[PDB]
Structure formats: structure tokens, C-alpha cells
Design an enzyme around this catalytic site. Sequence first.
Site, short mmCIF file in Angstrom:
data_model
loop_
_atom_site.label_atom_id
_atom_site.label_comp_id
_atom_site.label_asym_id
_atom_site.label_seq_id
_atom_site.Cartn_x
_atom_site.Cartn_y
_atom_site.Cartn_z
N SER A 4 1.83 -1.67 -7.25
CA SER A 4 0.95 -0.51 -7.16
C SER A 4 -0.15 -0.57 -8.23
CB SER A 4 1.75 0.79 -7.26
OG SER A 4 1.04 1.86 -6.69
N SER B 155 -1.02 6.43 -4.47
CA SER B 155 -0.94 5.01 -4.18
C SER B 155 -0.53 4.71 -2.74
CB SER B 155 0.04 4.33 -5.13
OG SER B 155 -0.48 4.32 -6.46
N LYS C 71 -3.05 2.75 -0.57
CA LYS C 71 -3.16 1.29 -0.60
C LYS C 71 -2.88 0.67 0.77
CE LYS C 71 -2.34 0.33 -5.54
NZ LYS C 71 -2.29 1.77 -5.93
#
Length: 245
Positions: free
Chosen positions: A94, A46, A49
Site C-alpha cells: 500500500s 488505499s 489503488k
Amino acid sequence: VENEKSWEKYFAEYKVEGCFMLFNNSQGTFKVYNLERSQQRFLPASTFKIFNSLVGLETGVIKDTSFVIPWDGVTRDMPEWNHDLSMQQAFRVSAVPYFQEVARRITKPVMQHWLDTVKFGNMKISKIDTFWLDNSLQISPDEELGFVKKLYFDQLPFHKVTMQNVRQVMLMEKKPEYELSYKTGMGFSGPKTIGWITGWIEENGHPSFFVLNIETENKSLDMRTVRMNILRNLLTDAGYFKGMK
């Protein structure tokens, strides 16, 4: 570069292997635990991102930080993901589904172009909505430290409003003594669970950039709680959270 071997105490407390990098911009100091692992490549999970938000904003796919992508109706194991979310909410919880859709609208050739331009990790794409989670794309802690440093100083080939918007959504914790910004990551590589925390802490307007990367093969380990306790213990030992930096 200053090897800080005493920081092993905080990785042996939880019986995990890991590495920490801390660059103090004002002092110019660079302290690293486990330098060899700092050069090793792992899946970003994540923490991608950060990059996905920049490209989504730069290409116009995400209008701004309030842009809503509705829940696709698929009930998933994280309750916070099962709602219509703005980009800011999705980034902070997330929400993988939000940014899988973002990657789909960016499309693979454009996504590939931004990876080659920035030279992000091994720049490899498997599938358009899984490549940051399926161990195809990989990036080292050292490479993520340099990436978030360039982001903080507007040194990436994006527009300044794009980069400003991403820095703002990263703000997680604000007290009079410090301001804490980061993105967490958790991914799997065979029997191993990889944990990331990448970001910066600001005290009196001075930024210190950090990358935490740990791994465990213990399936029972609460990675989410462990990564955060280790981070706080490392920054406390480094003299942060008092407003003196």
C-alpha cells in the site's frame, strides 16, 4: 438481501461501528450487516489503488506489474515505502508514494474521464495526488462491492489483460482450502479513522465478494490488526476457510 443482525457481535467486541456485505456467487445469497451504512459514502483511501492500477495499466503509464517507480528520496514513516518498488510490491504494501506518481503521470483530465466513464463514487477530484485520501472522493461500501464484482467478471470498460493483472496482484493468501484476495484501506475523516477491506475469497473455484467498512474515534485503536481480526471472525462465522464453499 438478508440482514444478519448477529454479526454485530464482532463489531461490539472492539467497540467500533461498521458494516459487512457478503455476496455468495454460487448460492446467490446476499448477507449484510448494517444496511444503512452500506449506502453511506466514505473516502476510499488505499482501496482506490484498485482503480488507480487499472487506469495506470490501461493508459500505459504502468507497463506491467513489475514496473518500477524509484524511491523519491523522501524518508517517510513507513519503512517499506522507502525503496524502489514494482507495482506489485507497492500495491501489496500500500505504498502511497508509488501511486501518487502514477496519478501524476495519468494527469487530471484523463483521471477525470475514467471516473465519469465508470461512475466511480461521487467522481470528484481535489488534487491529482491526494483526492482519494483527502475526503474529496467518496464511495459507499455498496458501490465498492459492485465495483469489485464487475472487475472479477471482466465487466469494466478495460482490456482483459489490464483486469487480469489487477486480480493477480490482489492475491494475498493461498492455502489448499481457499484463496483470499483483497485491498486494505485506512483514512481519516475529521476525528474518525475509517478502515476498509474489499475483495473476494475463493473455495473450489467459487467466489464470494465482501466489503468491510468500520470506523472508530479511538486514536489508540490498532486499526490494522482490528480490521483483519474482524474480517476473519466474520468469514469464520460464515463458514469459510474450510474448503466447503
